[PDB]
Amino acid sequence: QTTGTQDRAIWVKLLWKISYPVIHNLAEGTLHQNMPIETRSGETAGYKDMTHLEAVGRTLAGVAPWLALPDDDTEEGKLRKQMREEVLKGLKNAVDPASPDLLNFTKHAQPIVDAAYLVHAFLRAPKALWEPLDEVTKERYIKSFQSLRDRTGAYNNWLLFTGLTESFLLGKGVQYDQFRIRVSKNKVKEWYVGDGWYSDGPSFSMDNYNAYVMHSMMVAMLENLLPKRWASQKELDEAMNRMIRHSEFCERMIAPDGTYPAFGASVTYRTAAFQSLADVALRKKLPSHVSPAQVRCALTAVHRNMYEGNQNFDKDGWLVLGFNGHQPECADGYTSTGSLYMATLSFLPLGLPADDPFWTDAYADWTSKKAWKGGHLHKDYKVEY
Amino acid sequence: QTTGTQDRAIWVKLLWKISYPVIHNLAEGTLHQNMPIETRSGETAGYKDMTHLEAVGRTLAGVAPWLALPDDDTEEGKLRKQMREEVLKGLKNAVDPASPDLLNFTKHAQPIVDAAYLVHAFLRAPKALWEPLDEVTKERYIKSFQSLRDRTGAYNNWLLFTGLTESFLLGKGVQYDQFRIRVSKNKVKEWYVGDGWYSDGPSFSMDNYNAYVMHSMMVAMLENLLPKRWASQKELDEAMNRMIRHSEFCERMIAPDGTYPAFGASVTYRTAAFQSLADVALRKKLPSHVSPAQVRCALTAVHRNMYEGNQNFDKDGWLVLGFNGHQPECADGYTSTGSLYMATLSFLPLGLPADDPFWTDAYADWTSKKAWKGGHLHKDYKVEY
Amino acid sequence: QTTGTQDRAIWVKLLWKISYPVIHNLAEGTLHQNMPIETRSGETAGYKDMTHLEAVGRTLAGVAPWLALPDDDTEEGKLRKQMREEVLKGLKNAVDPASPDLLNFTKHAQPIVDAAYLVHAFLRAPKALWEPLDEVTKERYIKSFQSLRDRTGAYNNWLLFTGLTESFLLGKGVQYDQFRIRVSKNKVKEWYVGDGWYSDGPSFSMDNYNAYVMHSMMVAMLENLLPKRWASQKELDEAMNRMIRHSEFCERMIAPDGTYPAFGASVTYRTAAFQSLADVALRKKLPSHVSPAQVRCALTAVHRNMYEGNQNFDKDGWLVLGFNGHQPECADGYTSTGSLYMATLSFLPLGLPADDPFWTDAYADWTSKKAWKGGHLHKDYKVEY
Amino acid sequence: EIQTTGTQDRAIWVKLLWKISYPVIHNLAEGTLHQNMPIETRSGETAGYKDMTHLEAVGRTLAGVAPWLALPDDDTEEGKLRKQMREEVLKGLKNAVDPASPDLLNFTKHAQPIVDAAYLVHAFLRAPKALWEPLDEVTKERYIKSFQSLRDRTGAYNNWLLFTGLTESFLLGKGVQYDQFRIRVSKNKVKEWYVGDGWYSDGPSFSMDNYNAYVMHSMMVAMLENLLPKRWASQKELDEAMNRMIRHSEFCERMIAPDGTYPAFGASVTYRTAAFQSLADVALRKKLPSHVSPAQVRCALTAVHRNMYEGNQNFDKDGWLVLGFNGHQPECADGYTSTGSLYMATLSFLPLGLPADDPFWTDAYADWTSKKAWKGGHLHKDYKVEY
Ligand SMILES: N[C@@H]1[C@@H](O[C@@H]2O[C@H](C(=O)O)[C@@H](O)[C@H](O)[C@H]2O)[C@@H](O)[C@@H](CO)O[C@H]1O
Ligand SMILES: N[C@@H]1[C@@H](O[C@@H]2O[C@H](C(=O)O)[C@@H](O)[C@H](O)[C@H]2O)[C@@H](O)[C@@H](CO)O[C@H]1O
Ligand SMILES: N[C@@H]1[C@@H](O[C@@H]2O[C@H](C(=O)O)[C@@H](O)[C@H](O)[C@H]2O)[C@@H](O)[C@@H](CO)O[C@H]1O
Ligand SMILES: N[C@@H]1[C@@H](O[C@@H]2O[C@H](C(=O)O)[C@@H](O)[C@H](O)[C@H]2O)[C@@H](O)[C@@H](CO)O[C@H]1O
Question: Searching chain C, which residue's CA lies closest to the CA of residue B179?
Fold first, then answer.
């Protein structure tokens, strides 16, 4: 039905619908005032100290590739530029000690996680979202990222979060902790179990956290370590090839009706279950059996199944606790309204230009859709790397 | 739409459509003459020595619980008594040296696999499928199961097959290889990676072999080792809970349209991907937030999406290579027509009586269906056991 | 003080003091009649079913290389011929059910250990101790080794014993168990911990069992599997190289006074603690900076510290429970008089001819002797292989 | 005859511990350690070594003499020697971080200071009242900053992790800023590296050498002790390392030969009797196992002490340690070993930190295990443990 160009307009519309309340309010210093703090228990204490950074860091981590595109004068180009300026205005506010939207980095341990997503935003759009900020704003982000070191010894997983962050400071040529990078890189490698899956900690689990955290961030950390001879091209390649393998499962779990199963912890992160697939696509490294077009069509179906209606939004435009609908019963205890903005992490292909094959090739059936209609189903097999 | 009593009727109709060509031809001694030998390459050499025992063992492993029921006068009862007699007659012919449907145990290593599935049939229905056999037939199977030690080894993902087969021999009071049972038990425990998942051999894959082989056989073997103190109630509970946890994911991977992802090796085994769910349901051990009726309805959707139409059958009603359609391009090199009769393994809940709540309870949306329409969605989390 | 030629005359004399009471009695049919059964508890029930095969198989495995030499007219050459002939005679009585000295292979699991040692004798001197046996005697040994499989014994550190035994059956072209060879080969490798040390079981231990069993039997098993493509040359070099490393520690723990530490389990096996050193010496594969002569002089000092006097012998010339003297308190509960004939296992260098540099090169201090007196001391360091 | 008493044995250990350690301690007090201490290396090069070897001499020396100095003062001839040497130590410790002093020690250059700061920290942990508390507050703060400046050179070798962990636990104990993450990682990596029967691996690679005595056991236990009161390491963990050390000491006590030698094997045999720090530490804690008595440990290590220090074969013409094992044998020195490196030799004298009236020093002579076994005496059965 819809074309690649129409698909892009859909993604733009849905990505705007998710991310704009976060970005715009931060730009107006009203994010604390206007964003709900919805929790399963209903308690806001504790949550209120951490939830805004989660919203900013997760929102920008997903919109960043789109905003890294060169400006132009298309109807989309206007939107990209309007969004980017509001983002930069927001980031100055988030570290301005005088702004009512100043973001917490010191109370609680949770800031470790979401500074990593804010760093991923920067690593995905450095020329668009980091460099234009003024030097005092840059310094505050440098100091805020460094201040996280008094809590990083905490949760076993969360190791990679602070590795990503320290490798960000290494790549910005300021003080960084070699130890936290060596430990986290080496532990993520040890946590590989096979066939494109790590464990997020000592015990393996079948959940979406390989796409939520592990694959995208390990590659991004290793890329930072490479130029300084801290990681080798061989272990960058090994992590990259493992993300490419993990994406095959993610593409294959999209059903013919454009749904995907709800399993494991934090199903409230919705389409961030596909960040592995989305990152691989943005890097033009999709597996050989998978055409870009079928990734665009599958994720377009998932996107409109989950964000075109308002089942996942409240009366003022914010994401509500749930999976597809208002389902607070499925939210983990650490989840609040801010954490839900993991939703953006499937929209990374927007960082491909509008003239990329991914957005221009004719519609294509994705794997499961071919499988169930008697079409060409490729053989799949475990990999040993 | 349909009621539980209709769902039972559909399952019987569809299990009949899968297994009757195999059981009837073997009973009449024309299984070799009539059954196709389809392969991805088109060659029949090698395959023709092993494909028939594949069809017989794989089929019986799945239909055995249904045939363990006591006899009734009802229409369904007439079907059961009729099918059971043809299995008994076919089992006689299969080790009769004069019958043209003599099956191969002695050439190649592959009879190791399929002897284990045939053993499983005997294990799931001893009084209905084993005790009625004549003494000569009994000793012939005992001898041929013992002749399999000659090939053995690979130390890999066939090891659990021989462990099941030697545990059968132990349960029957005959000579058996204690070392093979011990190595299979300890190695399968050591291959547990977590959250209900084993690795099949020393290599983790994300595929259906946990359903195809691991959970159902490990539990069945331990149950054979329990009476004689070769396994403990502790390690049996361990495997039982591991299978139950695994079933949680399989139930959740049924999409609202009654489909499920195609991923990993041997996707050609179709609904065998749900044996772990089917075995748990038969044992009345579904995790208590997963109702028996919603398992019945979910697998009714999968069962007729794959078997009610003929996209998976040739002109004579045999299974063909593929997933949903004739798709020989998804088949593994080792796969042939008889391999496909794994398809029976999701029908084990027909071993539950017609008045069991599994077949009599109200219609119920399975987990994905509720999740995507905005109904209750039970939170999930990784387990440590 | 003493020359190489005299050193050899001492090894022959002391080896004769140890091995002849076992060998001569077995040849005369009087081993059961004459050999004591000494135990820490003083009990003999149970021990009396197994101690005799312990004595034979442990004794032969140490004298075998000496007996593999070709005959000559020298004072020492006449002794080899006399001993080999008594060994052949004893071996025929051993499986002769008319002989009073028919050894037990059927009661208890212990036969697994000592059959393996008996097998090691044959492997070290095939031409001299196996090939001259009559055909009925050869077949009885084949049946006796095969009849052990019913007793796994588990213990998991008896795996190498059955693996060596089975690989001996393969080496003779008769029916062997593949599975047992494969599992024992792969387990010992899994049990490598580093730096020339295996763990003899799940956990590492600092004891002499690496020299009692692991290295010599692992190298010997692999050498059997090499012709039949059953193990690669690379995994034979690996095991060989690990033994050569281990021998360095054993060479170095011989103190300047010709003692060595008493430590770990089963110190009652006495100079068998040097079996890896002795086997490396026999194979002319000592490392660069370990002279063959210094191994000769180091082991000569140990050999007469323990065997020249009578502290370790009883009034009848049999080994007694102890380290150096009658010290039954250090015996394991499973140990009896027969167990003690592991003491032959440091005498393998007599498998080198008298004209070999090991026996003709002039005296030389050993590593600890040189170091404590101030001479050259080569840098040691851990190895990675 | 040749068999000494317990009172004599303590005197011999004082004489010998004094022969090793007084050149280092007295020169640092005088401020002439850089001037006078040799810098001996197998190659002969001094570049790089001269930046690290002085802290090596200081930290290693102090970690071995520290228990002796923890004893309260008295007016015996030995109590005089402790008072004098202690006061020189506090003098040398002031010079060591005086920017004015010429014996100022390096903490900024190279990675090696991580190692030797840890040994110095271990002296402080073994005699807090005697070597740390009497320091002026300026000198104390200076040490704190030097220990904290070690984090910028980090993410170093597989091993060395225990060193930084002990250091960070020391800063934890003093109530000053510490890196909790470096503590969490070194506690857990060491727990993962246990292979069994009393042996860790020093990093991912297992090796049969004396580094379980050199570093592993004493610093693991000493680190967990700092972690216990602070709700950061359980009694279960601390007793676990403690029993593992007691098991390790059984092998080390057993490897002493009847003639009073021990085998040279594995890396850095140049550390000489540091191969007995595990035995020495367990003897000092009075947690020897049931079948090894304090007397046989004293007598065994008295034989070892004077087989290597009574004579001058390990000393140069000025009383400095030379490269080797028992003699001038520089060919067994690793490339990282200098003259400072060799003052690990003090770590076997920990039992001098038991008072002169302890059973360790008062009980009659007693053969040690190997000595008893080779002459036909009681030999206790050994067996691998599972803990
Ligand atoms: N609160 C702990 C929990 O923290 C959660 O971790 C997530 C992750 O990526 O691991 C992150 O997405 C989320 O924002 C954060 O709240 C997590 O550490 C688990 C597992 O140890 O335990 C919870 O106590
Ligand atoms: N024939 C080999 C093949 O064996 C296949 O293994 C499957 C399994 O359990 O993994 C089993 O379901 C199937 O019936 C059996 O044919 C397989 O082991 C592959 C590699 O895994 O190599 C083939 O030679
Ligand atoms: N009897 C068991 C005991 O067997 C002993 O094992 C030794 C070995 O090689 O492991 C062997 O040298 C000796 O002949 C044999 O008697 C031992 O396996 C221990 C530990 O598993 O348990 C005892 O019951
Ligand atoms: N410089 C490296 C070297 O450092 C040495 O480590 C020793 C240890 O504990 O392993 C320590 O005793 C010594 O003071 C220190 O200089 C060592 O890490 C080795 C590792 O093989 O490599 C050397 O480059």
Answer: C152
